[PDB]
Amino acid sequence: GEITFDGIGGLTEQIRELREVIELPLKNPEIFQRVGIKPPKGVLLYGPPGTGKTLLAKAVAATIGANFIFSPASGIVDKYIGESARIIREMFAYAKEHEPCIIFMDEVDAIGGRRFSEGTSADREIQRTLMELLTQMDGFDNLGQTKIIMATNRPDTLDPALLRPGRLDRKVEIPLPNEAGRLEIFKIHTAKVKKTGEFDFEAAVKMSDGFNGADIRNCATEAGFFAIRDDRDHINPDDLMKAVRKVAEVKKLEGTIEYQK
Amino acid sequence: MTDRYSFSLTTFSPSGKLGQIDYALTAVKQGVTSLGIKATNGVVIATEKKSSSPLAMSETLSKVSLLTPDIGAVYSGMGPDYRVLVDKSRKVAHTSYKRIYGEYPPTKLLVSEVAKIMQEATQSGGVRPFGVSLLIAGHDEFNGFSLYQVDPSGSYFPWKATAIGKGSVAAKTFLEKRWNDELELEDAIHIALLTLKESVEGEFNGDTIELAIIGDENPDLLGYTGIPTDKGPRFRKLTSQEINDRLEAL
Amino acid sequence: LTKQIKEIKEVIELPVKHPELFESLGIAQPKGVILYGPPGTGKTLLARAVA
Amino acid sequence: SPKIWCAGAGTAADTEAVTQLIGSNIELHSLYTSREPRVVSALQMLKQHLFKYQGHIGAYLIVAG
Amino acid sequence: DKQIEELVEAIVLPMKRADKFKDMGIRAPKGALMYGPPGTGKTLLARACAAQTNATFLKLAAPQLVQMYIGEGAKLVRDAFALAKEKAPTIIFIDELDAIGTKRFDSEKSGDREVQRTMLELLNQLDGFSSDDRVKVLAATNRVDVLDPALLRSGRLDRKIEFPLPSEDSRAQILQIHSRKMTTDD
Amino acid sequence: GYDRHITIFSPEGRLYQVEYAFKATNQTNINSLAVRGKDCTVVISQKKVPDKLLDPTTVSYIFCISRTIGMVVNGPIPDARNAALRAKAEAAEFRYKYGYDMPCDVLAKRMANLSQIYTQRAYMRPLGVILTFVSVDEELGPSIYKTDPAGYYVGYKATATGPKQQEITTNLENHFKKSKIDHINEESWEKVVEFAITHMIDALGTEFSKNDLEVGVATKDKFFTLSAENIEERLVAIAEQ
Amino acid sequence: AVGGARFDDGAGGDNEVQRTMLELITQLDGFDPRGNIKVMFATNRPNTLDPA
Amino acid sequence: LRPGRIDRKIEFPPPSVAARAEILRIHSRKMNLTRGINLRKVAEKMNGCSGADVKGVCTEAGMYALRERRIHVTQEDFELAVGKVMNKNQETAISVAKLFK
Amino acid sequence: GENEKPDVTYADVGGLDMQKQEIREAVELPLVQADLYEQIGIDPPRGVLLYGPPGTGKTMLVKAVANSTKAAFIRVNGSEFVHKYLGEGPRMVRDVFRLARENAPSIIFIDEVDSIATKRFDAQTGSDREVQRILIELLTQMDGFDQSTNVKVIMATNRADTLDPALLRPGRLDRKIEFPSLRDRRERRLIFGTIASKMSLAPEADLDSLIIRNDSLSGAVIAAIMQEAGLRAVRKNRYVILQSDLEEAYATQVKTDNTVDKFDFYK
Ligand SMILES: Nc1ncnc2c1ncn2[C@@H]1O[C@H](COP(=O)(O)OP(=O)(O)OP(=O)(O)O)[C@@H](O)[C@H]1O
Ligand SMILES: Nc1ncnc2c1ncn2[C@@H]1O[C@H](COP(=O)(O)OP(=O)(O)OP(=O)(O)O)[C@@H](O)[C@H]1O
Ligand SMILES: Nc1ncnc2c1ncn2[C@@H]1O[C@H](COP(=O)(O)OP(=O)(O)OP(=O)(O)O)[C@@H](O)[C@H]1O
Ligand SMILES: Nc1ncnc2c1ncn2[C@@H]1O[C@H](COP(=O)(O)OP(=O)(O)O)[C@@H](O)[C@H]1O
Ligand SMILES: Nc1ncnc2c1ncn2[C@@H]1O[C@H](COP(=O)(O)OP(=O)(O)O)[C@@H](O)[C@H]1O
Ligand SMILES: [Mg+2]
Ligand SMILES: [Mg+2]
Ligand SMILES: [Mg+2]
Numbered sequence A: 001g002e003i004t005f006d007g008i009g010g011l012t013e014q015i016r017e018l019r020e021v022i023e024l025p026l027k028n029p030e031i032f033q034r035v036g037i038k039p040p041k042g043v044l045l046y047g048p049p050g051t052g053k054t055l056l057a058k059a060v061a062a063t064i065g066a067n068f069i070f071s072p073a074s075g076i077v078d079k080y081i082g083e084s085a086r087i088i089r090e091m092f093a094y095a096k097e098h099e100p101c102i103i104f105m106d107e108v109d110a111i112g113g114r115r116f117s118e119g120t121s122a123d124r125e126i127q128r129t130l131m132e133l134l135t136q137m138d139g140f141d142n143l144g145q146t147k148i149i150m151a152t153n154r155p156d157t158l159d160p161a162l163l164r165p166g167r168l169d170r171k172v173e174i175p176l177p178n179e180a181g182r183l184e185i186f187k188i189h190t191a192k193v194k195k196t197g198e199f200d201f202e203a204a205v206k207m208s209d210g211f212n213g214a215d216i217r218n219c220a221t222e223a224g225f226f227a228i229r230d231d232r233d234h235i236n237p238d239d240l241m242k243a244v245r246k247v248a249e250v251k252k253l254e255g256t257i258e259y260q261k
Numbered sequence B: 001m002t003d004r005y006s007f008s009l010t011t012f013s014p015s016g017k018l019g020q021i022d023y024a025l026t027a028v029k030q031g032v033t034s035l036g037i038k039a040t041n042g043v044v045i046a047t048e049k050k051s052s053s054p055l056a057m058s059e060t061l062s063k064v065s066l067l068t069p070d071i072g073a074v075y076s077g078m079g080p081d082y083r084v085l086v087d088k089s090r091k092v093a094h095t096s097y098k099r100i101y102g103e104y105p106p107t108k109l110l111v112s113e114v115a116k117i118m119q120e121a122t123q124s125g126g127v128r129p130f131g132v133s134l135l136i137a138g139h140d141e142f143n144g145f146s147l148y149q150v151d152p153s154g155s156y157f158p159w160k161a162t163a164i165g166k167g168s169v170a171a172k173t174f175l176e177k178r179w180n181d182e183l184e185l186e187d188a189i190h191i192a193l194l195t196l197k198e199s200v201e202g203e204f205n206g207d208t209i210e211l212a213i214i215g216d217e218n219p220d221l222l223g224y225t226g227i228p229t230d231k232g233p234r235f236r237k238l239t240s241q242e243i244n245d246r247l248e249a250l
Numbered sequence C: 001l002t003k004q005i006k007e008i009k010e011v012i013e014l015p016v017k018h019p020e021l022f023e024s025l026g027i028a029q030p031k032g033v034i035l036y037g038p039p040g041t042g043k044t045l046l047a048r049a050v051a
Numbered sequence D: 001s002p003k004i005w006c007a008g009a010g011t012a013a014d015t016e017a018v019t020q021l022i023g024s025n026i027e028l029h030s031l032y033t034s035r036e037p038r039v040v041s042a043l044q045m046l047k048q049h050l051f052k053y054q055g056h057i058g059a060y061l062i063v064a065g
Numbered sequence E: 001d002k003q004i005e006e007l008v009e010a011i012v013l014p015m016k017r018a019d020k021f022k023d024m025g026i027r028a029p030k031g032a033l034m035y036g037p038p039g040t041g042k043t044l045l046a047r048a049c050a051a052q053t054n055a056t057f058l059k060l061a062a063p064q065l066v067q068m069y070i071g072e073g074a075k076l077v078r079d080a081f082a083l084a085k086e087k088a089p090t091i092i093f094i095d096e097l098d099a100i101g102t103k104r105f106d107s108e109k110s111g112d113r114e115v116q117r118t119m120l121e122l123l124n125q126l127d128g129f130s131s132d133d134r135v136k137v138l139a140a141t142n143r144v145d146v147l148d149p150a151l152l153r154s155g156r157l158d159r160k161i162e163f164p165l166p167s168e169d170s171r172a173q174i175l176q177i178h179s180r181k182m183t184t185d186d
Numbered sequence F: 001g002y003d004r005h006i007t008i009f010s011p012e013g014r015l016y017q018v019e020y021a022f023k024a025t026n027q028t029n030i031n032s033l034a035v036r037g038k039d040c041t042v043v044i045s046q047k048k049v050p051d052k053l054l055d056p057t058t059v060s061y062i063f064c065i066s067r068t069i070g071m072v073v074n075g076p077i078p079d080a081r082n083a084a085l086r087a088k089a090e091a092a093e094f095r096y097k098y099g100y101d102m103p104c105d106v107l108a109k110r111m112a113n114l115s116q117i118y119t120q121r122a123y124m125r126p127l128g129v130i131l132t133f134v135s136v137d138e139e140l141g142p143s144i145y146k147t148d149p150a151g152y153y154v155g156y157k158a159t160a161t162g163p164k165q166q167e168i169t170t171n172l173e174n175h176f177k178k179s180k181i182d183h184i185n186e187e188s189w190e191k192v193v194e195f196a197i198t199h200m201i202d203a204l205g206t207e208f209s210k211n212d213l214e215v216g217v218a219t220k221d222k223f224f225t226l227s228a229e230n231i232e233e234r235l236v237a238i239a240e241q
Numbered sequence G: 001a002v003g004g005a006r007f008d009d010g011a012g013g014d015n016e017v018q019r020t021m022l023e024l025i026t027q028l029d030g031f032d033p034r035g036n037i038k039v040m041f042a043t044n045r046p047n048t049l050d051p052a
Numbered sequence H: 001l002r003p004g005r006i007d008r009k010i011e012f013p014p015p016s017v018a019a020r021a022e023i024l025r026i027h028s029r030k031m032n033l034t035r036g037i038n039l040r041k042v043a044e045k046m047n048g049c050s051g052a053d054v055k056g057v058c059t060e061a062g063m064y065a066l067r068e069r070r071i072h073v074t075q076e077d078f079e080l081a082v083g084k085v086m087n088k089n090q091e092t093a094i095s096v097a098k099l100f101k
Numbered sequence I: 001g002e003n004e005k006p007d008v009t010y011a012d013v014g015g016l017d018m019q020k021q022e023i024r025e026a027v028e029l030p031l032v033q034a035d036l037y038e039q040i041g042i043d044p045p046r047g048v049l050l051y052g053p054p055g056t057g058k059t060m061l062v063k064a065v066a067n068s069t070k071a072a073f074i075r076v077n078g079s080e081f082v083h084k085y086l087g088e089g090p091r092m093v094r095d096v097f098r099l100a101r102e103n104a105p106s107i108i109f110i111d112e113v114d115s116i117a118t119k120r121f122d123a124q125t126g127s128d129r130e131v132q133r134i135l136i137e138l139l140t141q142m143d144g145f146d147q148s149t150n151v152k153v154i155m156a157t158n159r160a161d162t163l164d165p166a167l168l169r170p171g172r173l174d175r176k177i178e179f180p181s182l183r184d185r186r187e188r189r190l191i192f193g194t195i196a197s198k199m200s201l202a203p204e205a206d207l208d209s210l211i212i213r214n215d216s217l218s219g220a221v222i223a224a225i226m227q228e229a230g231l232r233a234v235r236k237n238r239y240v241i242l243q244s245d246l247e248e249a250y251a252t253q254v255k256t257d258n259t260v261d262k263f264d265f266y267k
């Protein structure tokens, strides 16, 4: 099912910006060919984890109705080739049949290396898997019909090679959600679970400025614990007020505010 | 990175060449391409200015400051080191030659006094070398037109032609091909513009380009006419309009 | 340079071919040899050529 | 300076000397500020110098400009 | 005092109130990790808490059950995981994580990977609102900076507890505990 | 690194210390604005409204250094105060030394020279504040001189400072091209303030109350701060948008 | 060394020594019967000894 | 470095002009002989710096005959070939220095 | 490079026509004709140094030659050589040279060597020792590699003093090419010409104004400009790019920093 484009908040703006990049060359490589430019393939996404870069990749895929392959590479991570060799070969073959198709290459950096020169010798073994993938998806060939979107979450494990042109064409920002984009998100969460009627969020969102959306779910759950502790199955507006303060502390302490290269 | 001996300026470096002094040169390179050409009957100094912010006024950024009315200076490098060094040059000169010998310095003497200041910001530990290398171009009676370089080390040398900054390589060779000292000044100004024009071609408008000559006296700019014997100012800074005239002569 | 050829000849060829002559006529036997001088002289070549 | 002239009375030696010493500081001022100093600026600087020695330095001057 | 109050929120209360958790629908705490200086009684706490929750207390260590070869033992561990989930309710106490942490690039692809992966599986399956309430997970480690990077992604351990330095009050009480054993000297 | 700490030349030969000061001067997040009207120099800065534990009015970023000369400060407050002393002090000393009011241009030059001395001093850590002098100058009329923490200084037709400086600049640039001059339109001192207030609101997108601004105005022979309520007179027409 | 210092610190590193070390710590630490077992440890320096 | 068992040491200079004449002569014979026999001139006029240098002269002089689609060299070619090889050796090696002393 | 070969041909090379000529003579022709060299009797041209900073299309040149040689092309990187077991590196040097002999003619191309070749080293790190050993064996093998059908080692660098200059030097590397990146008018003009060919342009503004305004702009800057230009062209439904659209696209991209971003803080 499409992740509801209304329930993406504070990054409304991101969805619309995106289809310029993606929808026009995916449906018709014809227009960019006649225009006179090499058709673009390779798009790099980047935002502090929990802003929903993955979530945005999905949002766009449903609209077009294009086939969707989400592959985390952190679920199969290994040194030398093993299980990865089997998967990636299979995975391009499925993508080719279901074309037009988008591969959301999630945590590309996982099997991503760093070049080193005196470093750990093992990290270069890891790097090789990533290079094998790259050639299968596209060789010398440039297609828009099958296209690759690369998403990173740690930037210092990210491959210096994969930054370069010829592997990459756009470097698309995905920024923090908005101030009252965060409010939209806060309200959605609490509608889903039980509540007696809560409207103390006007205050609560302000303290919880700078939050990843992932982190907003965490103050809502803890508020909810507080309700069950009180012997209620309804979050009271009092409980929510309690939660946001304590959750704000850790959140910024241990916070990811990095934007990957 | 480097040694704790080479960061120190009270400590003989292993190599004997400080790390410090070498940093000062890296910075000179990073700055503007400034040049000097010596002529029979003049010296021309010319440079491009930083574009800076769009709404920052360009005029106020001055990379040619007159030390005396008859002797100007040009540098590559940072603004702050430039201004402080410049107040020190004038000030030490007044004491040691405008009250003693009650007259403007020979160019050689002024150049000598500028090296000494430089030298002291390299001798004393914990005080970094001046961030700037000069050309001091000038005119005095005794030794005619003269052209100098003063290094942040505190060594100085006269030249026929020198250029400094990123485009130093380019410029020096161009001057050689096209010119020699025996040629007149008028030719060199057109030449110098062209040389600097390799450097940058997006804008070469006379707003962003500061061009001056030290040459003949101007008895008008003496400013207390009716006495002729006093030399007028040797230096005359050429306005943007004047540059533009000199661009259609190229 | 042939300067060089006589100097290297004495040192390697005679003790290898006949240690028995060298030992007796001289005293002891020569050891390792270190070739020094700039790159690109063709020192490697010399080493191949004797062999 | 070119447009600040004065004529000196008093002890002759002092009048030349003070003009030379002060001269430099005025010249220093001019260049420092990229602006022609005020007539009053010369006046002020001149006044303090003399004042210190309570007038033994005996320059009495008409300052014009 | 503080850590006890915190552990009891994460553990005891959800165990008994499990119906309430289902209704509202929010996840119950999927495991608590305790870390920082030894001697703070990581051990101890878990034993007392399990007893209150009446839930079978396994005291366990993930690389210790690797016996000899990592062939016959990687497999032993897959059985141990299976056993431990079954016969719920339970709180499995898994200890020191440092040997299988391996944040390095020279992270073994050997059988050391298998123990580690089955660690991710245990935690993932608890998510929901029914699986969190039966099967509870405690974990103990000293250095927290050497861990697997997929562990710092998502909420693999749903609660992270840092020990604070002891206070005056804390010292004075621990002394009393020791001194009672001895003859009372006023 | 040791390389970060040394006050003496870095291996790069461009100081790490200098880049750091530049970081600092955006911790407070004060967007300020200074423009040159025809015969009036307007400076505006956000007046934060903290909790009641502090009075709001007292909190300020616009300071009266001397007659005509005002100073807007961007970057941390305790260092602001340190700097402030030296500039007030010299304006006085110049008046004693030279028997005439100090011009704007000369005060900025003095402070660039002090900035550079700071990195030659081992003990001292360089001040990490922006000093922007505004005045109706003696000769030059409306004048804006912006001084950097490093010690670079440059004059301005108009300027803004902050992390959100970029948006404001664009409006001011295009405005000046359409108007085909460098002065904000209208001889009247009052309506130029209002054109500044308005342009601040646009760029930032946030309507500011009288509570959220402070307006310092330069005329001939005084720099003075307007009342809270004066600000409002402008604000009201603008506020319905 | 071996059941003494960790060799994790190294670039490629090693942890066969962490296995040996670990086992000993847990036998000592917590409940576990003992038949009047004295524990003597010979280290040349306490520094080398794992702080654990 | 320290005593041990190393004892014999043979020092090799970079060529002299005499030695340079010899190396140059014998490669030219195998290849195509320098006509007007000004291979002796080339060695007398200048010193290279290596015998590696000298084999580079040999290659280039021969490449000059190739551009014309000739298969024999002359003196005119060696005079061009030497200036190119030898001068290039100096411009790569000098760039490292700034302006010290 | 022959199993699946590049689409880069000498025709697809636009600008650098002057640099391009020398590189074919040196490299491609020993391999296609041994016979030419034998008739005069010269030693074949040796290695070729490619330097010029990236955007000078060093790799691009070798992509061209890869098609035409019809014959082996071995494209390897510096990464392979530096440690993979803390001991792999010395072995790895030997295998590329051997592998070349088997499938001769071959082009040996090493992309990075700026980090393998250093004047000084540190033997205290154990891992570094292998870096040192790779450099020394390469010097040795090259002397035993003369008078072979394989072209003598070709390598690409940012700079010619990263390599030791005394050791790695003319007559190993007798051609050492500097690429124009400051660039002349002609050189610029040819790069614009690759684009001008690719799609018709509707004249709406001076073509040559754009050339003059580019101070030194490299090939990569010029490709990027077109890429933006055409993104706007999709929306409009234009299929022949206005010369006005390129002009505004240049205006928004005044690359190589210009003055506006370098000058802003080196003041
Ligand atoms: N005298 C010579 N005659 C023939 N060719 C020569 C001569 N000297 C050098 N060369 C050429 O130079 C090439 C490289 O020189 P070589 O590596 O043998 O030098 P080396 O002085 O022993 O250096 P290194 O410092 O590398 O050990 C040789 O393979 C050969 O083609
Ligand atoms: N909080 C406590 N109060 C009193 N005694 C304590 C306390 N914590 C630990 N000790 C004492 O120290 C002994 C050893 O505990 P130990 O140092 O193994 O602590 P831990 O926090 O469980 O660490 P780890 O398992 O990482 O070694 C206990 O058996 C107990 O007697
Ligand atoms: N006290 C000593 N005993 C023996 N020989 C000595 C003594 N002192 C000096 N020598 C002289 O040094 C000569 C060479 O010694 P050699 O170099 O074999 O010795 P080492 O100290 O065992 O070193 P290395 O194995 O590093 O070469 C001997 O043949 C002898 O002439
Ligand atoms: N734009 C958003 N709208 C709603 N919730 C959000 C948003 N951004 C983040 N989240 C919440 O955080 C969860 C986890 O982020 P995830 O999709 O894993 O992103 P990333 O790839 O950036 O780590 C999302 O599934 C969603 O529940
Ligand atoms: N002849 C040319 N025509 C077009 N663009 C060129 C040309 N030569 C080089 N370039 C540009 O140079 C950049 C680099 O080319 P590449 O072969 O990847 O090598 P490197 O960065 O190693 O020199 C590309 O962006 C390419 O557009
Ligand atoms: Mg993801
Ligand atoms: Mg050799
Ligand atoms: Mg314990």
Ligand SMILES: [Mg+2]
Pocket: I054, I058, I059, I111, I156
């Ligand atoms: Mg390359």
